[PDB]
Structure 1
Amino acid sequence: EAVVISGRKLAQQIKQEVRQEVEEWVASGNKRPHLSVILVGENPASHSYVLNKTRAAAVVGINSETIMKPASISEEELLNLINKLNNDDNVDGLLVQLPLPEHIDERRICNAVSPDKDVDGFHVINVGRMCLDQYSMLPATPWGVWEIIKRTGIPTLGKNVVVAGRSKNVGMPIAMLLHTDGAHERPGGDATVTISHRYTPKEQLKKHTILADIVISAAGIPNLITADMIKEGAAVIDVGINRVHKPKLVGDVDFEGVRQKAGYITPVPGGVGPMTVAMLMKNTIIAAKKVLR
Structure 2
Amino acid sequence: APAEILNGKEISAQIRARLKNQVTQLKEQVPGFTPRLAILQVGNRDDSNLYINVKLKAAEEIGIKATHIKLPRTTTESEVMKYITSLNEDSTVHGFLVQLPLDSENSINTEEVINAIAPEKDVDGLTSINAGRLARGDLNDCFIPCTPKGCLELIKETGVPIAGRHAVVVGRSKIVGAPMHDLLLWNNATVTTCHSKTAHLDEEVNKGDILVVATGQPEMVKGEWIKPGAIVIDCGINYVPDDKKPNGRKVVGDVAYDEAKERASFITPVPGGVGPMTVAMLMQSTVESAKRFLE
TM-score, normalised via structure 1 length: 0.90
Letter matched to residue 288 of structure 1: A
Q: Deviations over 1:157-198 (max 9, x none)?
A: 11111111101121001101101xxxxxxxx22111111112
Per the alignment, residue 115 of structure 2 pairs with 111
The superposition leaves residues 14-56 of structure 1 with CA deviations (integer Å, 9 ceiling, x where unpaired) of 1122111110111121422111101223443333322221121
Q: Is the 8 A contact 2:208 2:230 kept in 1?
A: yes
Identity of aligned residues (%): 41
Within a 5 Å distance, the mapping from 1:1-293 to structure 2 comes to 1-28=2-29, 29-101=31-103, 103-134=107-138, 135-179=141-185, 188-201=186-199, 204-245=200-241, 246-291=248-293
**Which string of whole-angstrom CA distances, capped at 9 and with x for unpartnered residues, describes residues 67-95 of structure 1?**
12234432221111212222222222110
Q: SS of the residue aligned with 2:251?
A: coil
Provide the C-alpha distance between the structure 2 equivalents of 1:284 and 1:129, rounded to a whole number of angstroms: 18
For the residue of structure 2 that corresponds to 1:207, the secondary structure is helix
Whether the 8 Å CA contact 2:226–2:264 is kept in 1: the answer is yes
Distance verdict in 2 for CA 1:112–1:217, change over 3 Å:
same
Name the SS of the counterpart of 1:195 in structure 2. Answer: strand
Instruction: Check whether the contact 2:45–2:103 (CA below 8 A) recurs between aligned residues.
Output: no
Deviation at 1:120, TM superposition (A): 0.8
Task: Say which SS state the counterpart of residue 238 (structure 2) adopts.
Answer: coil
Q: What secondary structure is seen at the aligned counterpart in 1 of 2:211? A: strand
- Name the amino acid aligned to 1:67: I
Gaps of 5+ in 1: 180-187
Bigger drift between 64-73 and 154-163 goes to 64-73
Q: CA deviation at 1:101?
A: 4.7
For residue 78 of structure 2, give the secondary structure of its aligned residue in structure 1.
helix
The structure-2 alpha-carbon separation of the partners of 1:223 and 1:189, relative to structure 1 and needing over 3 Å to count, comes to same
8 Å CA contact 1:136–1:292 kept in 2: the answer is no
**Deviation (angstroms), 1:292:** 9.1
- Of stretches 93-102 and 145-154 in structure 1, the one that deviates more from structure 2 is 93-102
Tell me: CA distance 1:146–1:231, structure 2 relative to 1, closer, same or farther (3 Å).
Answer: same
Q: For residues 82 and 141 of structure 1, what CA distance do their matches in structure 2 show?
A: 23
Cα deviation digits, residues 218-239 of structure 1 (max 9, x gap): 1111111111111121111011
Query: Normalising to structure 2: TM-score of the pair?
Result: 0.90
Give the corresponding residue for 2:244. Answer: none
For these two proteins, the number of residue pairs brought into alignment is 283
Instruction: Sort the Cα spacing of 1:38 and 1:198 in 2 relative to 1 into closer, same or farther, 3 A.
Output: same
For 1:41 and 1:159, the matched residues in 2 are separated by 45
Distance 1:280 1:56 in 2: 10
Which ranges of structure 2 fall in alignment gaps of 5 or more residues? 242-247
Say which SS state the counterpart of residue 237 (structure 1) adopts. Answer: strand
Runs (4 or more) in structure 1 with deviation over 4 Å come to none
